[PDB]
Write a protein that binds this ligand. Structure first.
Ligand SMILES: CCCCCCCCCCCCCCCCCC(=O)OC[C@H](COP(=O)([O-])OCC(O)COP(=O)([O-])OC[C@@H](COC(=O)CCCCCCCCCCCCCCCCC)OC(=O)CCCCCCCCCCCCCCCCC)OC(=O)CCCCCCCCCCCCCCCCC
Ligand SMILES: CCCCCCCCCCCCCCCCCC(=O)OC[C@H](COP(=O)([O-])OCC(O)COP(=O)([O-])OC[C@@H](COC(=O)CCCCCCCCCCCCCCCCC)OC(=O)CCCCCCCCCCCCCCCCC)OC(=O)CCCCCCCCCCCCCCCCC
Ligand SMILES: CCCCCCCCCCCCCCCCCC(=O)OC[C@H](COP(=O)([O-])OCC(O)COP(=O)([O-])OC[C@@H](COC(=O)CCCCCCCCCCCCCCCCC)OC(=O)CCCCCCCCCCCCCCCCC)OC(=O)CCCCCCCCCCCCCCCCC
Ligand SMILES: CCCCCCCCCCCCCCCCCC(=O)OC[C@H](COP(=O)([O-])OCC(O)COP(=O)([O-])OC[C@@H](COC(=O)CCCCCCCCCCCCCCCCC)OC(=O)CCCCCCCCCCCCCCCCC)OC(=O)CCCCCCCCCCCCCCCCC
Ligand SMILES: CCCCCCCCCCCCCCCCCC(=O)OC[C@H](COP(=O)(O)OCCN)OC(=O)CCCCCCCCCCCCCCCCC
Ligand SMILES: CCCCCCCCCCCCCCCCCC(=O)OC[C@H](COP(=O)(O)OCCN)OC(=O)CCCCCCCCCCCCCCCCC
Ligand SMILES: CCCCCCCCCCCCO[C@@H]1O[C@H](CO)[C@@H](O[C@H]2O[C@H](CO)[C@@H](O)[C@H](O)[C@H]2O)[C@H](O)[C@H]1O
Ligand SMILES: CCCCCCCCCCCCO[C@@H]1O[C@H](CO)[C@@H](O[C@H]2O[C@H](CO)[C@@H](O)[C@H](O)[C@H]2O)[C@H](O)[C@H]1O
Lengths: 140, 64, 98, 52, 63, 120, 55, 344, 459, 53
């Protein structure tokens, strides 16, 4: 149910680490599986075991990025006294980017992904505080 | 011609990131900015503190 | 009515699924499309008969007519691709990748 | 319809068999004729947003 | 010309460019309310037509 | 948004209701720009077909400019009608619902404690 | 070190790279209807799932 | 094609969409869709070359699947509400499937892989119809049901298509595929603004058509179909370069040119509705379009590419192909912003 | 303002309807006369700024820039008269049309009343400038330079569009008078900080900040002389003008949102000025000098004191004129030796004694010679920043030393030293070039006589 | 005749004349507050029509 994902924001960060890490890991895994399904449906692989290896690799990589992101964000918010400070999501997104770089065996991806994912996470947190709305409904 | 080309357009093509290059670039770029940031911020915060209390006397500052 | 409509919707879903995933022969894909046509016509027919709406029974026949016309166009295209490549295999339809 | 050619010209190519309450052959009204008629006459005038 | 021309023309500029602003914000409010409540001339989505109902005596009394 | 406005008459360029608005002045900047566009289009046609850019096809150029102005007049009239209708519906609705558009009372500046931020 | 190398790498060339990587990732399609309709199927499923979960 | 076939086929292509936009009944809108689908194919396969046949088959399969999905939506709406039009009470899944299938017909991402191939295969004079006239009907079907659409689905498709078209444009060297990707991006904008204010969707459709038709006729002039080929216009037909540059830049969407007005007005509406994130991302990614148009401008107008010995006879021979409509549309598409208030 | 815009537009019909022989003379003359007409905007005998209609306005900040723009066009035509010597008539007329269009758009931009006038007329400048760089440039990399110049600015600008739309939705208008007279305090929310950035970033890029200054050294060493002149005389000041007009709403956020960009400016100024010491391309050296000066301008504008604004405006004008003159001089030597290296040609004071005088005067304007308005601007910006924090004098002084140093380095390297006797092609200075340099210098001298004209809104 | 090409010299001065006329029109439209502003409002002198015309 969407209750599981909406539970991420039940309690501010720095608390219920394990639960938030689980939720982000699941979300990353889902994104990875979707991407893997696309990447196998197009650009097929020679062997069906190759295809399943590909889906495994994509899924595990995405899950790892999500898990590291959640863990680092919660750890930052907890160790420092600022619960809702977007710098925390930025550090978490940078951790995710670095993990992606490691998984891909490349420092350039580490750096680019750190910057981009950290900015994305920080903007997400800012939006959640400030009340921004993605996918709004017609108000005119 | 060769000298100018070598000091201009051959550089980035013949550049490779290395640990030493990354660290040197990052420090020589950001570090001075951080240093001057701390200097100016501490100075201006002290100035604002004194001005708030009224210790600082602006004897004839008319144009600022 | 309810169980019939459920099974018919499932049938159309399966035929759509069959169309979406190919299997070499283009003729089979055309047949799957034609099966979806059958299911949709049956849906409309049973709905109209259930509602006693005799003013909407002119519409399943239009469905059949237009589906027949498109099926004929499909068969002609099959003839042309066969003339081009010697078979109806969809693998050969890959030139435009470049 | 996106362009109201039919309303403009006064013709009714397809506006007469839209719902179950329209004229049927040999005056055989469809199931729920009364209910549909009530709903549609209720919802005329007021916009769709208010009718809902 | 002299100062009056510029000064008073500027007053006219401000008048026009404040009224336009208030009307634009008022347009926002009115369209929001009309969309949300369907009680105005705009955003009146269509509903099926009553004229093409058939009221003649039918072949079954209870229709 | 305006499609469902009561009294809407389908596919009518200028509804008779539009005759009550002041008609466009025929030396309007918009119509003049239309004429300019037509003239430039004639010149472009000459250039593309490899013709004397300004000398050749004067009948063609005249037709282009006159056609642009002729279409522009009527289109401008319709646009004026539509904006006038929008304003009419605007103000009618606002007048009908005074509750949802209350008129604000503004305090003078003396009584408003606007914070002051030094620029030191 | 900075002006001719690191700034160019960081701001312009990083963007240029990433976009070229993404275009070479997306555009190159084998061009087969079987695979294309498989992707359309995945779109089908994803829209269904979104509808279901969002209710 | 003999004259009678030309008359009937062209008349049916014209009829289909008119039926779709003048039909109050969903089955008749579907009839219009089928008319367009059936009648276009012979024009596509007129050449009878191996690539043409494959392009026609791809078009046929995809469009037939889309039409069947739409017909399922219509039939289920009938089962529910005893009528042939979508009502506010209609089940949400029905509208979702309709939007999805009309998206497939229109070519929007992620159902976009079919359009580039068909456009590459088919000749230019039919590519124009494919990328202009065949979009009016599906977009009309959506606009007639705009108040009931799903903002999430529509925005997702729109942003997906903006990103995908922008990225796809770069790699391609072929003009036909480039115009296909441009079509995808502009349709992305159109659908992005559809649920909020369809008047601007129609404005964008008009401006995109008025910009694409001139470009397609420009390509037809010398049958250019590649960056290298179009690079030779400085020799074969110098006059057209100025307007080609202006028109590519407009399609890209620079401020002074008209192309700005669609994007600017659409961003304005989205911001009014508080769609800041999607608006920002779409505006940002609409600049790759300017990049892969600027490459064309560089190749054609601003730099002079190598030419061939035999172009001298092309110079010698006379030319009588550019139409009046080319000049009219090109100027009125790339020099009309000062009249923007009247457009919206 | 419409007595200045319409003649500018009519220059185009004159350019295209003139006979091939008299086209240059006619357009140059009528452009000078348009420049004269533009002086009517200096009859401001009252504190009430001029507002000619609902669309066009003028101010103490906009009048000097508009007059400078009008002044530049004749000089641009004179500077371009030569390198277009052997092009076909239509191509020459195309160049002249591009310059006329640039002048029209820039005057309209500076005289625009609504920021969504400004956002359109500001980016419309990209097309003429891009064409000038890419079509008539010399070396091969002009295409890359054009791409950089276009896209840096577009990436900067799109967020400006978003911010402006949000502003209009929130306020109801975008007339700058109304914004000024109904402004209100922003709150330090993250969304407001993001706005501040969105409003400020496009202008900061056009005022190349130290980290986003890579598009000037390219655009300039790939652009022809007229392109360089208009660019680093007016285009660079578009950013400053936009910042000045728009900062009124963005308060009080500036107090702490200016620390990053003040720091970047005050450091990049030193870095770029130092780069000027060891650069082997005269065009590049001038471009980096311009970057340092714009660094100063940005710092002052982002501190917002009366001195800051007034000195920033003065230095904007002074840099316009001085950098223009320097680029014309360098192009003068380039038209003969067909190279851009500074080392190659030396001792040219032994063969162009008077142009050496113009070189010396330009170098003095660059190094900031009292009482020149260049100095006055830099001095007042220095006073402002010293008030802001008394430690900035260290950076200011280091930059002053290095500025003097590269300014004299140019002169010693080129004008002085043994004449590269192998250069047979060095030809006596053209009266065209000499008159161009005179027309650049004389306005500077007259304004140094009368600084009151070029002060900003504040003073 | 040399007017053949010396007619072209009338464009720019015509530009100036036309611009001045249009400026007058622009000031015509903005007539309200012609003499209704706190600072400068006055009773017209005898034998007068418009303050600033
Ligand atoms: C001066 C400025 C001049 C500008 C010069 C050229 C500018 C170049 C830019 C090119 C794009 C401009 C068009 C922009 C645009 O289409 O706006 C969207 C505009 C918005 O329409 P809408 O408000 O959403 O609803 C329109 C209804 O479909 C239908 O609404 P309706 O039923 O109320 O009536 C529609 C109206 C439409 O009149 C028109 O001719 C509109 C044509 C616009 C295209 C440009 C002309 O009347 C007619 O259809 C013609 C009447 C003929 C019989 C009269 C007896 O789209 C259209 O109206 C076109 C739909 C086709 C209608 C026919
Ligand atoms: C702006 C984008 C510029 C893209 C670059 C275009 C370019 O390089 O031109 C071709 C260039 C090759 O030039 P070419 O080899 O010497 O021969 C081409 C001539 O068309 C040779 O043909 P022609 O000598 O027989 O005809 C010359 C033609 C002169 O026609 C031209 O070739 C120049 C057309 C571009 C003028 C740009 C006006 C800028 C607007 C400012 C706002 O007529 C005149 O001499 C004076 C007539 C008045 C000017 C024509 C204006 C009519 C269209 C206005 C539309 C405005 C759209 C904006 O490359
Ligand atoms: C050729 C001249 C032909 C002879 C003159 C026509 C016969 C005549 O005496 O009537 C004068 C006729 C009527 O004057 P009036 O209404 O009795 O006197 C009051 C003024 O018109 C007061 O004017 P207004 O306020 O009543 O009307 C203003 C209207 C004026 O609408 C317009 O006509 C604008 C004309 C644009 C020039 O709209 C505007 O506010 C202009 C904004 C337009 C956007 C400008 C900035 C956008 C970026 C520029 C892009 C340009 C297009 C692309 C260029 C090519 C790129 C490749 O005015 C004109 O012919 C010239 C209009 C000048 C408007 C300002 C131009 C800037
Ligand atoms: C209280 C404020 C006091 C301010 C004083 C600030 C002092 C700043 C010191 C700067 C040091 C400049 C320097 O070292 O000399 C550069 C320069 C180099 O002279 P040169 O080495 O003999 O050049 C000979 C050529 O190489 C070879 O050509 P030539 O030998 O045939 O030359 C003959 C003669 C021919 O001279 C002329 O024909 C002059 C025509 C002047 C027209 C001025 C029109 C003004 C229009 C107003 C509207 O000299 C020139 O060609 C010089 C032309 C450029 C003069 C531009 C006027 C600069 C005035 C500075 C203020 O000497 C000057 O002309 C500067 C004038 C003296 C400095 C200003 C002292 C105040 C006098 C005010 C009366
Ligand atoms: C509503 C819910 C929204 C969920 C959004 C999920 C987004 C998932 C991420 C996007 C999927 C991209 C698929 C992909 O990874 O690319 C695969 C293929 C490239 O080939 P390959 O080298 O094998 O894979 C490298 C991947 N880094 O390249 C491709 O296959 C092209 C994929 C194009 C279509 C992507 C559509 C994504 C959005 C679907 C919305 C419905
Ligand atoms: C869910 C999976 C449904 C069945 C999958 C069948 C095997 C497969 O690979 O799917 C694609 C299939 C084409 O498979 P094919 O080209 O013959 O190559 C087989 C390589 N092992 O495509 C097909 O054969 C069409 C499958 C239609 C399944 C309809 C019934 C599904 C009932 C559950
Ligand atoms: C904060 C936002 C503002 C910052 C925005 C930055 C956006 C700037 C985009 C600039 C893109 C220019 O894209 C430019 O493409 C040219 C193609 O000629 C590349 O050119 C180069 O590519 C590669 C090097 O990687 C070489 O093999 C090639 O020979 C060389 O020409 C440039 O390396 C790239 O920079
Ligand atoms: C946030 C969105 C911002 C969008 C704005 C920025 C636009 C970015 C433009 C991306 C395209 C630039 O296109 C640029 O092309 C050049 C060649 O032309 C590529 O560079 C290429 O050079 C040569 C081949 O030409 C190869 O040796 C090299 O390995 C390859 O990379 C760059 O890698 C690519 O980045």
């Amino acid at each position: 149910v969407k209750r599981f994902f909406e539970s991420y924001h039940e309690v501010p960060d720095g608390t219920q680490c394990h639960r938030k890490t689980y939720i982000t890991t699941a979300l990353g895994g889902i994104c990875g599986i979707i991407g893997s399904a696309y990447s196998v449906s197009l650009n097929p692989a020679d062997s069906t075991l190759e295809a399943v290896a590909r889906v495994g690799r994509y899924t595990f990589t995405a899950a790892a990025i999500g898990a590291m992101f959640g863990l680092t964000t919660c750890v930052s918010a907890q160790v420092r006294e600022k619960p809702d400070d977007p710098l925390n999501y930025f550090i978490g997104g940078c951790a995710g980017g670095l993990t992606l770089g490691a998984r891909t065996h490349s420092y350039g991806t580490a750096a680019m992904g750190c910057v981009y994912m950290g900015t994305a996470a920080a903007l997400f947190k800012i939006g959640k505080l400030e009340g921004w709305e993605l996918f709004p409904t017609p108000k005119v | 011609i060769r000298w100018t080309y070598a000091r201009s357009a051959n550089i980035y093509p013949n550049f490779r990131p290395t640990p030493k290059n990354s660290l040197l670039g990052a420090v020589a770029g950001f570090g001075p900015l951080i240093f001057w940031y701390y200097v100016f911020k501490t100075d201006r915060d002290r100035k604002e503190r004194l001005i708030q209390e009224g210790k600082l006397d602006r004897k004839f500052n008319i144009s600022y | 009515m309810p169980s019939t409509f459920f099974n018919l919707t499932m049938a159309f879903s399966l035929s759509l699924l069959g169309t979406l995933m190919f299997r070499s022969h283009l003729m089979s894909t055309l047949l799957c499309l034609e099966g979806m046509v059958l299911s949709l016509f049956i849906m409309t027919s049973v709905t109209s008969l259930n509602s006693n709406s005799m003013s909407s029974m002119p519409i399943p026949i239009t469905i059949l007519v237009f589906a027949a016309c498109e099926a004929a166009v499909g068969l002609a295209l099959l003839v042309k691709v066969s003339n081009t490549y010697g078979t109806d295999y969809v693998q050969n339809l890959n030139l435009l990748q470049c | 319809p996106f362009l109201d050619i039919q309303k403009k010209l006064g013709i009714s190519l397809d506006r007469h068999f839209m719902f179950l309450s329209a004229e049927q052959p040999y005056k055989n009204a469809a199931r729920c004729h009364a209910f549909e008629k009530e709903w549609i006459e209720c919802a005329h005038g007021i916009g769709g947003t208010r009718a809902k | 010309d002299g100062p009056e021309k510029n000064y008073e023309k500027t007053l006219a500029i401000l008048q026009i460019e404040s009224e336009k602003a208030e009307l634009r914000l008022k347009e926002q409010e009115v369209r929001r309310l009309m969309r949300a409540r369907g009680d105005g001339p705009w955003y009146q989505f269509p509903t099926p037509e009553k004229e093409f109902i058939d009221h003649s005596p039918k072949a079954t009394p209870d229709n | 948004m305006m499609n469902g406005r009561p009294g809407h008459e389908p596919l009518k360029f200028l509804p008779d209701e539009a005759r009550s608005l002041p008609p466009p002045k025929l030396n309007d900047p918009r119509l003049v720009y239309m004429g300019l566009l037509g003239y430039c289009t004639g010149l472009m046609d000459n250039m593309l077909r490899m013709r004397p850019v300004m000398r050749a096809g004067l009948h063609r150029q005249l037709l282009f400019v006159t056609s642009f102005v002729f279409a522009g007049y009527f289109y401008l009239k319709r646009q004026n009608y539509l904006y006038a209708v929008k304003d009419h519906d605007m103000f009618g609705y606002i007048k009908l619902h005074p509750e949802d558009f209350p008129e604000k009372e503004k305090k003078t500046y003396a009584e408003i404690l606007e914070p002051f931020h030094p620029v030191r | 070190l900075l002006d001719l190398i690191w700034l160019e790498k960081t701001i312009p060339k990083s963007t240029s790279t990433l976009h070229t990587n993404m275009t070479t990732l997306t555009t190159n399609q084998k061009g087969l209807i079987k695979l294309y309709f498989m992707s359309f199927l995945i779109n089908i499923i994803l829209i269904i799932i979104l509808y279901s979960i969002n209710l | 094609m003999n004259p009678i076939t030309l008359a009937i086929i062209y008349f049916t292509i014209f009829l289909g969409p008119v039926i779709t936009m003048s039909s109050t009944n969903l089955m008749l809108m579907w009839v219009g869709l089928e008319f367009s689908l059936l009648a276009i194919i012979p024009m596509l396969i007129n050449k009878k070359n191996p690539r043409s046949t494959e392009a026609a088959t791809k078009y046929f399969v995809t469009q037939a699947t889309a039409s069947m999905i739409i017909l399922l939506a219509i039939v289920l709406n009938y089962k529910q509400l005893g009528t042939w039009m979508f009502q506010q009470q209609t089940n949400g899944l029905i509208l979702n499937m309709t939007l999805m299938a009309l998206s497939m017909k229109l070519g929007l991402a992620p159902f976009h892989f079919w359009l580039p191939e068909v456009t590459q295969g088919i000749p230019l004079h039919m590519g124009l119809i494919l990328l202009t006239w065949q979009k009016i009907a599906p977009l009309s079907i959506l606009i007639q049901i705009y108040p009931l659409l799903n903002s999430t689905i529509i925005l997702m498709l729109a942003i997906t298509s903006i990103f995908m078209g922008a990225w796809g444009g770069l790699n391609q060297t072929q003009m036909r595929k480039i115009m296909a990707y441009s079509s995808i991006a502009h349709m992305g904008w159109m659908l992005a603004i559809l649920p909020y204010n369809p008047s601007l969707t129609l404005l964008n459709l008009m401006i995109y058509i008025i910009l694409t038709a001139p470009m397609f006729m420009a390509l037809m002039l010398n049958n250019s179909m590649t960056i290298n080929s179009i690079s030779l216009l400085w020799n074969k037909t110098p006059a057209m370069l100025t307007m080609i540059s202006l028109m590519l830049l407009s399609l890209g969407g620079l401020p002074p040119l008209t192309g700005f007005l669609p994007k600017w007005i659409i961003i304005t509406e989205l911001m009014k509705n508080n769609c800041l994130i999607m608006a920002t991302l779409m505006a940002m990614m609409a600049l790759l379009n300017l990049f892969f148009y600027t490459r064309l401008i560089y190749s054609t107008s601003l730099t002079m590419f190598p030419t061939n010995n035999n172009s001298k006879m092309m110079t010698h021979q006379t030319k009588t192909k550019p139409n009046l409509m080319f000049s009219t549309l090109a100027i009125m598409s790339t020099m009309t912003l000062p009249l923007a208030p009247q457009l919206i | 303002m419409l007595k200045i815009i319409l003649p500018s537009l009519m220059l185009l019909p004159l350019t295209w309807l003139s006979s091939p022989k008299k086209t240059w003379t006619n357009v140059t003359s009528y452009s000078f006369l348009i420049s004269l007409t533009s002086l009517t905007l200096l009859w401001q005998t009252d504190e009430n700024y001029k507002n000619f209609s609902n669309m066009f306005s003028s101010d103490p900040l906009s009048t000097p820039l508009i007059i400078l723009t009008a002044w530049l066009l004749p000089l641009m035509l004179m500077a371009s008269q030569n390198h277009l010597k052997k092009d076909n008539n239509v191509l020459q007329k195309l160049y002249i049309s591009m310059l006329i269009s640039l002048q029209i758009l820039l005057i309209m931009t500076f005289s625009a009343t609504e920021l969504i006038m400004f956002y359109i007329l500001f980016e419309a400048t990209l097309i003429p400038t891009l064409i000038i760089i890419t079509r008539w440039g010399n070396q091969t990399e002009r295409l890359n330079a054009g791409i950089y110049f276009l896209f840096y600015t577009l990436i900067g600008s799109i967020p400006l569009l978003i911010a402006l739309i949000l502003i209009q939705n929130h306020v109801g208008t975008l007339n700058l008078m109304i914004l000024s007279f109904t402004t209100h305090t922003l709150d330090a929310s993250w969304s407001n900080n993001l706005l501040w950035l969105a409003c400020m970033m496009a202008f900061l890029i056009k005022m190349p900040l130290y980290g986003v200054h890579l598009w000037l050294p390219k655009a300039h060493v790939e652009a022809p002389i007229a392109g360089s002149m208009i660019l680093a005389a007016i285009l660079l000041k578009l950013g400053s003008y936009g910042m000045i007009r728009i900062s009124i709403i963005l308060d009080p956020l500036t107090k702490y949102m200016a620390y990053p960009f003040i720091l970047l400016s005050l450091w990049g100024m030193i870095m770029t000025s130092s780069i000027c010491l060891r650069q082997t391309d005269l065009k590049s050296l001038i471009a980096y000098s311009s970057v340092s000066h714009m660094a100063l301008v940005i710092a002052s504008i982002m501190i917002q004191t009366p001195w800051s604004f007034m000195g920033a405006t003065m230095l904007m004008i002074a840099h316009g004129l001085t950098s223009s003159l320097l680029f014309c001089l360098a192009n003068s030597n380039y038209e003969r030796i067909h190279s851009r290296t500074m080392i190659m040609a030396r001792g040219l004071q032994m063969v162009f004694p008077l142009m050496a005088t113009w070189w010396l005067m330009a170098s003095l304007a660059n190094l900031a010679l009292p009482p020149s308005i260049n100095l006055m601007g830099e001095l007042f910006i220095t006073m402002s920043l010293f008030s802001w924090s008394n430690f900035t004098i260290i950076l200011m002084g280091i930059n002053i030393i290095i500025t003097g140093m590269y300014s004299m380095y140019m002169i010693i390297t080129t004008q002085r030293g043994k004449l590269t006797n192998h250069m047979i092609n060095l030809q006596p200075s053209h009266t065209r070039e000499l008159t161009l340099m005179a027309l650049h210098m004389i306005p500077l001298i007259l304004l140094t006589t009368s600084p009151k004209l070029i002060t900003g809104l504040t003073m | 005749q040399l007017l053949r090409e010396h007619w072209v010299h009338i464009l720019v001065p015509a530009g100036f004349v036309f611009g001045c006329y249009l400026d007058r029109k622009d000031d015509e439209k903005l007539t309200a507050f012609r003499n209704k502003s706190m600072l400068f409002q006055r009773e017209l002198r005898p034998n007068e029509e418009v303050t600033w015309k």
